[PDB]
Symmetry: none
Subunit: 162 residues, 4 copies
């Protein structure tokens, strides 16, 4: 299995992502996305380009990426701080079941996986997420994929932020 | 016919359903009290599915930094906030809300330290064109400590391809 | 004519200010000092620095700034809520004439005027006041200078406060 | 001893009050007057009734009452925001001694005390002030009279305002 050959399921409607908010990243590749909460945002009313925004929140720090649909079931991201672009895909999505939401998404460096994010709001109980991670961590560079929530900062009264 | 004179006497409109706020996402703060909230984008978040207390969350986003406060409804049309980093509480109210009109959304909210105003946030997604917002800001300025309320969106940092984040 | 080149008359002795109390601001730059009564206060008996205090009173709101003499006929202000300093000067003073008191004072942001206050206790009849306002209105930012006493709140039996 | 029988010393000339400015309230009855600085103002030049004004300043909030002399060594107050009147008296005054100023004033609800204000600019060292407070605390409702200056807000570089 190589990164270019991973499943590319259709990007669900944006409202399906918003109704999942907030999510946590159970498995990620790089350290950057440990202990992280995901919130999706609709394009602003006056947005010229109507891009959505993904928020990756880690304590008092935040990474932001606008995204739009692209070819081959892709999401095309723009880093709001750097203007760097990336092409992402969904390995699967399972949003808004009666047991909540999960998905796994990725971006490729050719055959190797550059970044991986599996999010949920059900504490990792979706059987699809288990299968998906097992598959992804056998692609080249997928050895780096790890459980992301092990030893996270203590909270001060909020459930999904710290 | 006279404007309220102290913070404790400001108007307290019913808190709209959360959905009305989420559908306004994202907003910008046009007027704030402390300069912590200059150049800031607001995003509202529903309670997590597994949340024990069903608190919503307000995100105050300024570049690569974020301030987070959980909130729930309280009596007298209050929102009770819990700072997620410190655990400090505050009782907030809405001076007015005007969400999802044909010209977009605006509101102004505040929290008092007795008769003074401790914090003030006026948000919108229509570049400050709601006439309610103009008159609300004038009123709030006149209460004790309200002279610090200022326009919050001058000279904000340049963007790298996103409209509402930087 | 720019703000840095406006006149700087000697700050009168504090007693002359206190004898003028209370004043109203007839012309100001920002909206903050609309419908406002000025009262000057001597340093507290126990004050270590012996700063005087200017009180700006608008209904139930009070803004307070300690001040002392500085170089070049300046008054150095300390906002009592924030510890922020500002350097002020008098364009002119005309205190305790047989027709009462007036003055115009200002603070600069380099060449533009950041704030302007013209006070009196004679309903704006001092001819010096008219000429000072006409000059200040011509400095950069001075177009915002405006008459400050239109449509002020109704009173409940006191003359200078509401 | 009831409120109606408390001493009524002559109201000193206004200039004595102004020379005492600013004062702090060390003892009060209602907690409105905690952490409060008092400033006296002469009548506005143009005022038709020539009423003086008492300012009660607590941080950024100000209460204002015009006042004139009435019979039996009374001062008749007019709340500038609500138009409400009240007859006040001085239990004693001791202004502008070589150890500074102190006074205690009150207003009655028949035989009970409705409000009490003991002011000074010397941190409570006037022996008259101790005796006066003792006496007032024993009239009906005087049990509410408390020390007004515990745990007041921290300052930002001004001595008498915050
Ligand atoms: Cl993702
Ligand atoms: Cl808010
Ligand atoms: Cl001034
Ligand atoms: Cl008094």
């Amino acid at each position: 299995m190589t990164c270019d050959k991973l499943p590319k399921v259709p990007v669900p409607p944006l409202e399906e992502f918003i109704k999942s908010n907030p999510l946590q990243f159970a498995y990620v590749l790089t350290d950057t996305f440990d202990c992280t909460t995901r919130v999706y945002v609709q394009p602003a009313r006056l947005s010229p380009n109507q891009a959505a925004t993904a928020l990756d929140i880690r304590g008092s720090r935040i990474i932001t990426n606008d995204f739009v649909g692209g070819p081959n079931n892709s999401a095309i991201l723009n880093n709001c701080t750097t203007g760097e672009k990336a092409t992402w895909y969904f390995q699967y999505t399972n949003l808004n079941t009666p047991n909540g939401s999960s998905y796994c998404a990725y971006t490729c460096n050719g055959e190797e996986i550059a970044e991986y994010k599996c999010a949920n709001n059900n504490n990792g109980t979706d059987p699809l997420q288990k299968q998906a991670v097992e598959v992804a961590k056998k692609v080249p560079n997928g050895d780096k994929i790890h459980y992301a929530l092990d030893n996270c900062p203590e909270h001060h009264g909020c459930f999904a932020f710290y």
